[PDB]
Amino acid sequence: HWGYGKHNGPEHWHKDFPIAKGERQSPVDIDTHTAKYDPSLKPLSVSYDQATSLRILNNGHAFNVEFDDSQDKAVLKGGPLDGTYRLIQFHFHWGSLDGQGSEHTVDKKKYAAELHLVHWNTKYGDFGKAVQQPDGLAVLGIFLKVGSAKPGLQKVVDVLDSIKTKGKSADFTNFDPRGLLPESLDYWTYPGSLTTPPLLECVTWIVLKEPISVSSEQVLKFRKLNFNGEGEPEELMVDNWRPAQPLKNRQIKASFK
């Protein structure tokens, strides 16, 4: 099945998932000088005070921190969004070296990693229904650069040893995603898709301008994860990012001057 290798990676996905070559694919390069400031964008509202994490898991593509989304406990609203989007999980994409790893790029610059906080439109009742809708999901993307450590990330990095290989999961309660946010909520936004199969074109992307800094030690621990299942030859979980896709008929809007 699909992956990030030479024989199953991004250039191959279109055979099983034709929408790979579709009209609103993600990620994209964000050209900062051509993005249009939009004064009609309401302020972004991130309400994670009641977020209830459950589990962390290695699915062979990334690691995933899963949340209890059975009530409106952690939601994203405002900005370009209509209605209420509920946090379901977060994951990251990262590189083998600090000069690559992000999926979105900013004037062609690649960051060391990118955080995706995934949310679904309540109006659709569940995630599975939401992904069949053009406004089904809102994914908050946050760039990571390597510099000072991110204290709020440490709890995640310390549990990664327990989910080394594909199919491993661990208890992961009481983790506060607010600890992963930068100071500014300035953002770019555009209509796009999931960056992995099934690549469904159901995402309103909200990408924050300001990166967070993580330490070399923190990102090194991401890179010790495995794509393989337990007992297989070790294949390091690195470079699990899709490259920038054609912008086609889309305008990227900016919340800031």
Ligand X SMILES: N#Cc1ccc(Cn2cncn2)cc1-c1ccc(OS(N)(=O)=O)c(Cl)c1
Annotated binding site for substrate: 195-196
Nearer to ligand X, 139 or 144 (CB): 139
Q: Is 12 part of the annotated catalytic residue set? A: no
Nearer to ligand X, 25 or 218 (CB): 25
With binding defined as CB under 5 A, does residue 119 bind Zn ion? no
| Radius of gyration of the chain measured on its C-alpha atoms | 17
Instruction: Quote the least distance from Cβ 23 to ligand X, whole Å.
Output: 16
With binding defined as CB under 5 A, does residue 61 bind Zn ion? no
With binding defined as CB under 5 A, does residue 104 bind Zn ion? no
Alpha carbons 147 and 40: distance in angstroms, whole number:
35
Nearer to ligand X, 168 or 209 (CB): 168
From residue 209, give the alpha-carbon distance in Å to each of 89, 164, 170: 21, 31, 32
Instruction: Quote the least distance from Cβ 129 to ligand X, whole Å.
Output: 8
User: How far is it between the farthest Cα atoms of the chain?
Assistant: 54
DSSP SS3 for 163:
helix
**Annotated catalytic residue, options 1, 12, 14, 61:** 61
Instruction: Quote the least distance from Cβ 171 to ligand X, whole Å.
Output: 15
Tokens representing 85 are: 């989007």
Token look-up 């990676």 returns 9
With binding defined as CB under 5 A, does residue 150 bind Zn ion? no
Alpha carbons 25 and 103: distance in angstroms, whole number:
12
Buried b or exposed e, range 217-246, using 16+ CB within 10 angstroms: ebbebbbebbbbeeeeeeeebbbbbbebbe
Instruction: Quote the least distance from Cβ 162 to ligand X, whole Å.
Output: 16
Phi-psi region of 213 (alpha: psi -120 to 50; beta: other; left: phi over 0): beta
Instruction: Quote the least distance from Cβ 13 to ligand X, whole Å.
Output: 13
Q: Which residues bind ligand X (CB under 6 A)?
A: 57, 59, 64, 66, 69, 88-89, 116, 118, 126-128, 137, 139, 194-196
With binding defined as CB under 5 A, does residue 110 bind Zn ion? no
The residue of the chain with the least Cβ separation from ligand X equals 128
With binding defined as CB under 5 A, does residue 116 bind Zn ion? yes
Nearer to ligand X, 44 or 203 (CB): 203
64 contact choice in ligand X, Zn ion, none (CB below 5 to 8 Å, kind-dependent)? ligand X
Evaluated on CA atoms 2, 216, 139, 176, the torsion sign reads positive
Helix, strand, coil shares of the chain, percent, nearest 5, are 15, 30, 55
Interface contacts to Zn ion, rule CB under 5 A = 116
- Please list the active-site residues: 61
